[PDB]
């Protein structure tokens, strides 16, 4: 429908093209079509297969060859990427090109918006991290060269040439090095567009938050809606409409009561939902099993319930998932040493909560509420491993904002201490100790007496210890505990004689089958496979919207 008259486009866009022209000397290399031979560069057309330059663009613009403005934008970016492709990162033309692109970014955005568009930005997704089958946690860097096979087996340029000979082994089968692709990790997927069904304008799907399941009749831009005074049909796939639980309700009431007491300007309501609950078992690993299970001194496995929960806030009218946590709950039927214990598997956040100055407070309220809740059920003890994610890894949310800092261990330890200190002052937590002091207090003598949690530090270090010492589970146990003690919190919810005569633990909430949220892996995998990043407010809002559709539909 919306037809851009060629003069309309010329008038609107030509100022953006002049802005590039007016850059001396940066513009000069780009003002005329590259003559490879004159410019003393023969292989140019071996690399650059779709040449483009300012003059060619000016001409297409003057002569009405563009039907819509994104075609102009695409050519501009083709010109830039041609130059970034052919020239070295350190070269003259490269840096000139970079300067032009910055001028362009700033020029083009408000013009595109004048023309009825979401924005005028060129948007691409973050590059995925490439691992290496050659070693355990080797990784391949952005833009550096690497070797791959079937887009499945990749090797860093170092660890690839390490292997003696010309044959690699995958799995087991043998592949000649000549069968690998040599390539640079410089591939970035563009954001997708959706077309207004009325005016025909292409908008970024993430800018307008159009999801085909939620609005199956099709996308209609805000411009077209307002002209006829319409509004979008309600999004029924919201956080609030996910099923309630006793736990979710308890947590969200605690949070919102806290926010109401603070009475900070521009506060929003928080929604907390438990989205997974299932029964699982942790099995004792082979070292510890040989040492204590086979002689009947320790159970071969421990049953627990895992739960996943998330908190959401409305930001700019749209749901935003900002906090996530998975827990392991070992009930009263579980064998010692795990009986009546909870452990936090992992928690994660995306720093867009409003107001900022209450963000940490709100995270604390969620954790204190959770401790209070399980205490009420008759869990006696909480367990926290203060362990920051490894570099550029995510616990729950794929692709954090690059300006969201990740705490080192001392800051994270202090953060948990501040939370627990508030919990103590509220008489929820009786007291808490590091693992070394707690063991001392419990007069612990053997490794079989340490709580054994899925994924936790201690089951792994005990394997290592037994093997290193050639058979002892407990020789350097106190020394290992002392050494790592600042990192391991033991939290006493129910103290002393009362902890010995408790009734059975009965959870009033039902099981909640959701494979997507059975541990952290599935949602990370989904997010990676569907470009659901939490790296900006707009992408997190999109990703939350997609997450909520998945939770509602599956
Ligand atoms: C088994 C694993 C576990 O369950 S424990 C591991 C928990 N999970 C993680 O560490 C995942 C990554 N972290 C997060 O999502 C958040 O850091 C969590 C833990 C939720 C807490 O966030 P928040 O309440 O904002 O505290 P915070 O310390 O992150 O930030 C508050 C202020 O400190 C700053 N900060 C953070 N890191 C650094 C740093 N490395 N160097 C310098 N400053 C840092 C932040 O920028 C922030 O500053 P400000 O308050 O905005 O002024
Ligand atoms: Zn846009
Ligand atoms: Zn490697
Ligand atoms: Zn429209
Ligand atoms: Zn404030």
UniProtKB/Swiss-Prot annotation:
<protein>
    <recommendedName>
        <fullName>Histone acetyltransferase p300</fullName>
    </recommendedName>
</protein>
<feature type="binding site">
    <location>
        <position position="415"/>
    </location>
    <ligand>
        <name>acetyl-CoA</name>
    </ligand>
</feature>
<feature type="modified residue" description="N6-acetyllysine">
    <location>
        <position position="476"/>
    </location>
</feature>
<comment type="subunit">
    <text>(Microbial infection) Interacts with human adenovirus 5 E1A protein; this interaction stimulates the acetylation of RB1 by recruiting EP300 and RB1 into a multimeric-protein complex.</text>
</comment>
<feature type="modified residue" description="N6-acetyllysine">
    <location>
        <position position="135"/>
    </location>
</feature>
<feature type="binding site">
    <location>
        <begin position="359"/>
        <end position="360"/>
    </location>
    <ligand>
        <name>acetyl-CoA</name>
    </ligand>
</feature>
<feature type="modified residue" description="N6-acetyllysine; by autocatalysis">
    <location>
        <position position="448"/>
    </location>
</feature>
<feature type="binding site">
    <location>
        <position position="411"/>
    </location>
    <ligand>
        <name>acetyl-CoA</name>
    </ligand>
</feature>
<feature type="binding site">
    <location>
        <position position="406"/>
    </location>
    <ligand>
        <name>acetyl-CoA</name>
    </ligand>
</feature>
<feature type="domain" description="Bromo">
    <location>
        <begin position="4"/>
        <end position="111"/>
    </location>
</feature>
<feature type="domain" description="CBP/p300-type HAT">
    <location>
        <begin position="236"/>
        <end position="554"/>
    </location>
</feature>
<feature type="modified residue" description="N6-acetyllysine">
    <location>
        <position position="285"/>
    </location>
</feature>
<comment type="function">
    <text>Functions as a histone acetyltransferase and regulates transcription via chromatin remodeling. Acetylates all four core histones in nucleosomes. Histone acetylation gives an epigenetic tag for transcriptional activation. Mediates acetylation of histone H3 at 'Lys-122' (H3K122ac), a modification that localizes at the surface of the histone octamer and stimulates transcription, possibly by promoting nucleosome instability. Mediates acetylation of histone H3 at 'Lys-18' and 'Lys-27' (H3K18ac and H3K27ac, respectively).</text>
</comment>
<feature type="modified residue" description="N6-acetyllysine">
    <location>
        <position position="422"/>
    </location>
</feature>
<comment type="subunit">
    <text>Interacts with HIF1A; the interaction is stimulated in response to hypoxia and inhibited by CITED2. Probably part of a complex with HIF1A and CREBBP. Interacts (via N-terminus) with TFAP2A (via N-terminus); the interaction requires CITED2. Interacts (via CH1 domain) with CITED2 (via C-terminus). Interacts with CITED1 (unphosphorylated form preferentially and via C-terminus). Interacts with ESR1; the interaction is estrogen-dependent and enhanced by CITED1. Interacts with HIPK2.</text>
</comment>
<comment type="function">
    <text>(Microbial infection) In case of HIV-1 infection, it is recruited by the viral protein Tat. Regulates Tat's transactivating activity and may help inducing chromatin remodeling of proviral genes. Binds to and may be involved in the transforming capacity of the adenovirus E1A protein.</text>
</comment>
<feature type="binding site">
    <location>
        <begin position="347"/>
        <end position="349"/>
    </location>
    <ligand>
        <name>acetyl-CoA</name>
    </ligand>
</feature>
<feature type="region of interest" description="Interaction with histone">
    <location>
        <begin position="346"/>
        <end position="348"/>
    </location>
</feature>
